[PDB]
Paper text:
In all structures (superimposed), L-Ala, Na1, and Na2 (purple spheres) could be modeled into their respective binding sites (left). The distance between residues R5 and D369, and between residues E6 and I187, was conserved in all three structures (right bottom), as also found with Rosetta modeling. As evident from these data, as well as the REU versus RMSD plots, our Rosetta models parallel our crystal structures. In the absence of ion and substrate (Apo), [name] WT dwells between OO and OF conformation, with OO being predominant (black trace). Na+ enhances the OF conformation poised to bind substrate (red trace). Leu binding to Na+-bound [name] restores the conformational preference to the OO form (blue trace). Consistent with previous findings, the spin label pair monitoring of the IC gate in [name] WT showed a bimodal distribution between IF and IO conformations in the Apo state (black trace), whereas Na+ alone (red trace) begins, and Na+/Leu (blue trace) completes, biasing [name] toward the IO conformer (right).
Numbering used by the authors: 5 to 132, 135 to 511
The structure:
């Protein structure tokens, strides 16, 4: 089995797994939609009661499985709980990252396309003033790129450039993954994460210099970091905070587990896992939190910035920020640096969420790495045409896999590892080889607080929010639901074939 070559490479690869589009695009929108500082108290508590403990649990499960030649949850769940229902539940550890990859890599390809166009200066020129006259050319730029519907049909028509850039993006992902763990993912992380950190710090510094008649970047930081204890009673904020914690740390994707399956059986995971988790949170709240929101607040004020965040999920990062930059000398190049930052953040995450399918084809069906990578890329590239051409298919996949799925799977993996496998056996496995020990209080958190916290979350979610999404959406949501359900059945069939191959061997 491949292993990570160095401790630093392991940490930077895991940090690149975590640090992605969720830090720089998702977190600012989630925080702004939910009152800024009102969002941060639940967010911090969720990190301490969910993020950290599940990170350690996923590192432990992966290292445990890797020592027996298994890096994905169908086999690992079965090692922890010899029961054919364990293999079936483990399919979600292939399905969730595959479904997320199907729309994550496409969004990633937008950042590359925008980076290219901004580098070469093929960008809108606002009029030499009214905010709408500045924002509209950049809204039109995005809408022409992804092909937003101009009539009533729920149909997208991406530009030829966007389609080609998606092929290029897929090719870049493949060229890293096909070289493997140490010579591919690890080597790239050592280059990408330093670059990513420098670009982000430079953009924060540039954004901190923004000042208009409507405010300063400081006004944005006060909005994000000022507690509002009245919102501690709103379940929606807690739901939003925990969902972001899952998404930003790659928890419930089966991806941390697969990466940790390449950690040597004796090697520490307590300190390594905490460091990767801590690096992501720094990149999230310090870097991601200090670029988009302060820039938007400085130019428009809190109320307009909040409304911009609510209007869309891509408004802030693809329309508003480049528009703001356009009003400053060298703003087109700053836009390039922003989208180049997003691309590297995205790329280091998309190789991580495609590796589980690769590891399954290698570990369980005994495919060569070459064939495993090429077939995985083929499945993602083909399936992505649904997200490219059907309006709101992206949203449907992000909900079932990237929102509900991750939380459900995090509770599932905790119950399997800490209740069924055994809390004391799980606790020993986490701490074995640790440079540090997990604090004893966290044994009680993992066994009792974390599962109850999530169970309550999922119940209030399913009762007071989800029904709207099962009765109000447009009929085309069933196209995406049908397809991703078919993907689950396809992956279940592959697990079945892996069973019969081991039976026959
Ligand atoms: C199925 C993939 C369709 O892809 C489409 O292909 C057309 C010709 O191939 C191009 O002109 C379009 O830009 C592209 O979106
Ligand atoms: C990486 C580079 C991507 C290839 C650039 C393709 C851009 O081609 C585009 O599509 C149409 C041409 O068929 C026309 O609109 C223009 O020629 C151009 O806008
Ligand atoms: C979910 C499945 C999505 C497949 C969408 C592929 C649609 C390709 O679209 C085709 O592109 C042509 C290029 O000449 C255009 O004339 C038309 O839009 C269509 O014929
Ligand atoms: C997934 C569905 C995406 C298919 C893209 C359809 O593309 C085109 O749509 C137009 C209808 O308005 C017509 O040009 C044709 O029916 C079709 O080729
Ligand atoms: C919520 C969980 C966050 C609490 C982590 C604080 C660590 O707490 C420390 O851990 C040590 C190891 O058990 C103990 O020996 C110390 O007495 C304890 O204060
Ligand atoms: Na993240
Ligand atoms: Na990343």
């Amino acid at each position: 089995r491949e292993h990570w070559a160095t401790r630093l490479g392991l940490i930077l690869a895991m940090a690149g797994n975590a640090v992605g589009l969720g830090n720089f695009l998702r977190f600012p929108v989630q925080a702004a939609e939910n009152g800024g500082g009102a969002f941060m108290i639940p967010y911090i508590i969720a990190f301490l009661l969910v993020g950290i403990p599940l990170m350690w649990i996923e590192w432990a499960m992966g290292r445990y499985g890797g020592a027996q030649g298994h890096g994905t949850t169908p086999a690992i769940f079965y090692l922890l709980w010899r029961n054919r229902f364990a293999k079936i539940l483990g399919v979600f550890g292939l399905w969730i990252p595959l479904v997320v990859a199907i729309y994550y890599v496409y969004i990633e390809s937008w950042t590359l396309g925008f980076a290219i166009k901004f580098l070469v200066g093929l960008v809108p020129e606002p009029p030499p003033t009214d905010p709408d006259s500045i924002l509209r050319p950049f809204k039109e730029f995005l809408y022409s790129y992804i092909g937003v519907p101009k009539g009533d049909e729920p149909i997208l028509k991406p530009s030829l450039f966007a389609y080609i850039v998606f092929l290029i993006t897929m090719f870049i992902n493949v060229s890293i993954l096909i070289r493997g763990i140490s010579k591919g993912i690890e080597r790239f992380a050592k280059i990408a994460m330093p670059t990513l950190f420098i670009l982000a710090v430079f953009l924060v510094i540039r954004v901190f210099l923004l000042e208009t008649p409507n405010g300063t970047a400081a006004d944005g930081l006060n909005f994000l970091w000022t507690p509002d204890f009245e919102k501690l009673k709103d379940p929606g904020v807690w739901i939003a905070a925990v969902g972001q914690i899952f998404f930003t740390l790659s928890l419930g994707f089966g991806a941390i587990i697969t990466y940790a399956s390449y950690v040597r059986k004796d090697q520490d995971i307590v300190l390594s896992g905490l460091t990767a988790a801590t690096l992501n949170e720094k990149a999230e709240v310090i870097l991601g939190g200090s670029i988009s929101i302060p820039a938007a607040v400085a130019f428009f004020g809190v109320a307009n910035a909040v409304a911009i965040a609510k209007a869309g999920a891509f408004n802030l990062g693809f329309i508003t920020l480049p528009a703001i930059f356009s009003q400053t000398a060298g703003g087109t190049f700053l836009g390039f640096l922003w989208f180049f930052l997003l691309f590297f953040a995205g790329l280091t995450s998309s190789i991580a969420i495609m590796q589980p399918m690769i590891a399954f084809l290698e570990d369980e069906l005994k495919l060569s790495r070459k064939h495993a990578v090429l077939w995985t890329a083929a499945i993602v590239f083909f399936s992505a045409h649904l997200v490219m051409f059907l309006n709101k298919s992206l949203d449907e996949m992000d909900f079932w896999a990237g929102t509900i799925g991750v939380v459900f799977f995090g509770l599932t993996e905790l119950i399997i590892f800490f209740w069924i496998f055994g809390a004391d056996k799980a606790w020993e496995e986490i701490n074995r080889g640790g440079i540090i020990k997990v604090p004893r209080i966290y044994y009680y958190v993992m066994r009792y607080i974390t599962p109850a916290f999530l169970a309550v979350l999922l119940v209030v979610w399913a009762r007071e929010y989800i029904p709207k999404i099962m009765e109000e959406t447009h009929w085309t949501v069933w196209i995406t639901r049908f397809y991703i359900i078919g993907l689950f059945l396809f992956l279940t069939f592959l697990v079945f074939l892996a069973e019969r191959r081991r039976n026959h061997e």
